[PDB]
Amino acid sequence: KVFERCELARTLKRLGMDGYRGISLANWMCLAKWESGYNTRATNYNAGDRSTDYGIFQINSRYWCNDGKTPGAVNACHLSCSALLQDNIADAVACAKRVVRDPQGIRAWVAWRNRCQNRDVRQYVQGCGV
């Protein structure tokens, strides 16, 4: 599914993302926006290293979820990458929380550094009731 902006904001807030390990909701929104356009079913193959990115946060198979087909990979979220292609984003959120328990936090995603870091991200949550 492709979430509408404010629907997603409220969905993430219910799942406990607001301020998780210091990360505001508007940061998570900015991440989802630029990773996937708020689209849960997106996959992107990285020909360079044979990994794939999955779902609304484009979480990578080398470190985070198992797809069977990524050489040398691990699965720190202990999920099938299939779980990151559901319309229900609970598993994706749990996995995103796992990512940001590591030292880099939200910097783990380059798109966040590119499109969100050091910017005014207030617009992502404007009017959403969060």
**79 binding Cl ion? (CB under 5 A):** yes
Q: How far is the CB of 48 from Cl ion (least distance, A)?
A: 26
Judging by DSSP bridges, how do beta strands 59-60 and 51-54 pair with one another? Answer: antiparallel
**46 binding Cl ion? (CB under 5 A):** no
Cα 87 → chain centroid: 13
| Contact region with Cl ion (CB under 5 A), list: 5-13, 61-69, 76-84, 92-100 | 76-84
Q: CB under 8 Å to 75, separation ≥6 — which residues?
A: 64, 65, 66
**87 binding Cl ion? (CB under 5 A):** yes
Q: CB under 8 Å to 104, separation ≥6 — which residues?
A: none
The CA-to-CA distance between both ends of the chain, in Å, stands at 21
Q: How far is the CB of 124 from Cl ion (least distance, A)?
A: 11
- Residues tagged active-site: 35, 53
| Contact region with Cl ion (CB under 5 A), list: 4-12, 62-70, 80-88, 96-104 | 80-88
Residues within the interface to Cl ion (CB under 5 A): 79-80, 83, 86-88
